[PDB]
């Protein structure tokens with residue numbers, strides 16, 4: 001039903017992946033650091049309510065008739081729906097509030113990558129809130145109300161709705177398929193792998209940035225798929241792109257999805273061969289992205305793809321080397337990176353008196 | 363995950379319980395070959411039979427020739443039917459082709475211009491539509507994508523619309539969903555069990571003057587943007603006054619329970635429910651079946667969202683048009699704008715495994 005909001009880490013990273021996503025990047029409009037801290041506190045209080053399935057503030061009705069209700073009401077009668085709300089701080093936040101020297105060195109700007117076609121309006125952002133839930137209206141409600149609460153101090157830079165499995169009728173160990181029709185997530189870091197999370201996902205104090213201890217670094221990439229071109233490719237071409245077969249998802253030369261891959265048997269620019277840690281100095285990622293389908297473009301083509309999300313202990317040692325190695329990926333023919341942003345995701349809200357960003361702002 | 367039966371006197375997706383998700387696609391016809399279009403309808407009907415049963419189209423998603431593209435694009439593998447329905451409709455512009463001019467139904471009336479309209483012509487109209495409703499958005503998108511692919515060369519997607527959550531009800535025994543203004547939407551609709559009301563208000567009859575449409579219905583679609591910023595500034599009383607129902611319970615003003623019958627003269631003379639009620643419209647009654655949408659931001663700091671309004675009726679001239687005309691003075695107008703529109707004649711049902719979409723017309 002619900003996922004606990006308080007913890008050493010923020011929820012929404014290691015906790016089980018929910019069916020839907022509403023991701024929002026915000027820009028900060030206030031220049032007053034105390035006013036911003038006041039928002040972080042007010043947002044933290046709202047998130048405690050939202051993630052327990054309650055209305056923010058004094059609620060969505062029953063208040064004074066002349067007052068706007070504190071909560072806009074569209075989640076009334078719904079369930080917590082495993083909602084998690086994960087906040088992150090983008091590089092540009094640290095140019096405000098005297099925060100320049102507290103920007104973590106592990107919050108690296110991404111290089112330009114071959115084939116990039118980034119829409120600047122749907123890239124970057126001073127802040128992010130990742131809202132994950134099984135019910136998309138619960139996630140949209142949470143983003144809508146956080147934006148409302150913050151209006152006057154923040155605005156919404158860009159917003160992305162995503163989906164994965166529908167858990168009411170899809171087994172939870174079952175690997176979801178992306179919109180190219182392939183299983184996506186087979187060889188990933190799982191939230192159960194607490195030791196691997198310490199090695200590859202969570203910032204440690206010794207890493208250089210004490211306030212980020214127990215946080216993580218997030219890379220977001222809005223990746224369009226050339227659906228109609230991909231659907232014209234042969235089965236063999238599609239399986240060659242990835243190094244796994246389509247129906248079972250097994251590596252080339254293996255029978256079972258989760259059999260470990262034999263990379264030599266894949267084509268040299270197969271996606272799995274290029275992305276595997278063995279090909280990247282051991283670099284390993286927690287992938288947590290969602291499919292999207294926004295509509296139809298002007299040409300009749302499906303505006304669809306993957307909202308790619310990766311959490312790692314250090315952007316410089318996670319996403320950057322893996323994505324760099326994808327320069328020659330056979331998959332590049334069928335995809336285009338069209339938005340990008342990075343965020344430092346602080347440690348968790350430790351108890352009922354803690355607030356988002358308290359380790360950064362004090 | 364259960365299956366909604368595809369065959370019947372009527373197409374499913376109308377009186378059917380309203381499913382959680384929508385992918386709605388408008389198509390333009392590009393072939394002038396009536397025989398090829400008829401062949402397309404039969405192929406589409408065959409594919410819909412598979413899709414609505416949770417099966418892959420054609421020869422399947424894999425296991426064919428390596429050199430051939432798979433028949434089915436594969437992203438619904440391992441999913442369930444998820445109450446998928448696929449409902450096809452024919453726009454007025456279809457009847458300019460294939461010698462159909464004289465078969466265009468009188469009840470398929472063009473809408474008048476309405477005050478406040480700001481209709482995007484590129485996301486309005488359409489030679490035909492397919493409404494895909496399912497509890498799993500991936501199942502809905504997979505259905506539309508594969509129908510469009512099967513139709514490559516004969517039809518093109520003109521525009522499409524995703525609905526992340528329903529704002530309608532044909533099941534008054536279940537919870538009435540809320541729209542993004544936070545109000546229950548669908549309380550006083552038509553239920554799938556109200557067979558007499560469906561015959562009276564929804565299903566075309568032979569005596570109505572268009573024999574091929576007996577057992578079909580007529581669909582109006584309106585993409586309605588919501589002025590969320592302005593709404594969220596409004597007091598609780600202003601919001602409740604706009605509709606004529608309270609917000610929490612959704613009861614008519616002065617009533618304690620959602621489904622207590624309204625006393626209209628107690629509502630403001632411009633209240634939405636007062637103006638829309640059958641008694642204010644010569645008994646005109648609609649089956650509403652819309653969904654909420656988001657569409658990113660306005661580029662200027664604001665979430666952009668709305669409601670994809672769908673109404674089924676026995677005759678557009680005695681359903682949507684008189685009601686929408688009476689909404690000319692609606693208090694709700696301050697908070698919405700109609701920005702896309704389309705009408706379709708939705709043919710009778712696919713009677714059995716030998717039948718095909720549009721067989722009574724063609």
Ligand code: HEM
Nearest residue numbers: 178182183184185186187223272275276277306322323335
């Ligand atoms: C639309 C874009 C993409 C699609 C469709 C896609 C698809 C896939 C598929 C089908 C697999 C095999 C199953 C699995 O183990 O998860 C996979 C694996 C993987 N992908 Fe991607 N991927 C995309 C983008 C990316 C990006 C941008 C990165 C990193 C920069 C990435 C990194 C990885 C990694 C690390 C693996 C696991 C490889 C292993 O250790 O065996 N992918 N991806």
Ligand code: HEM
Nearest residue numbers: 541545546547548549550586635638639640669685686698
């Ligand atoms: C964003 C646009 C709209 C919103 C937010 C909205 C909202 C609502 C709400 C909250 C109700 C009361 C509960 C119910 O009985 O369903 C309602 C009722 C109704 N609406 Fe709307 N509506 C919109 C557009 C329309 C349009 C365009 C039409 C027709 C042209 C329409 C026709 C009706 C009717 C017929 C009723 C039921 C009245 C009765 O018999 O009591 N609505 N609407």
